[PDB]
C-alpha cells in the first residue's frame, strides 16, 4: 500500500511547455506524470 514518485525533472522544450524527463527506466512525459504526487 505505497505509491512511487520517480525522477520528475523539468525539461521544457521550445514550446513553452514543461516537459518532464523521467529517470524511471529512462522515460519521457509530456505533462505532469501520473505518479507526480
Amino acid at each position: 500500500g505505497a505509491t512511487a514518485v520517480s525522477e520528475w525533472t523539468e525539461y521544457k522544450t521550445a514550446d513553452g511547455k514543461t516537459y518532464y524527463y523521467n529517470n524511471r527506466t529512462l522515460e519521457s512525459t509530456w505533462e505532469k506524470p501520473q505518479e507526480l504526487k
Binding site: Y11, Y19, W30
Partner: peptide, 9 residues
C-alpha cells in the same frame, strides 16, 4: 554547457 532536451513522446 547546457544540455539539449530530448523530444517528448
Amino acid at each position: 554547457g547546457p544540455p539539449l532536451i530530448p523530444p517528448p513522446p
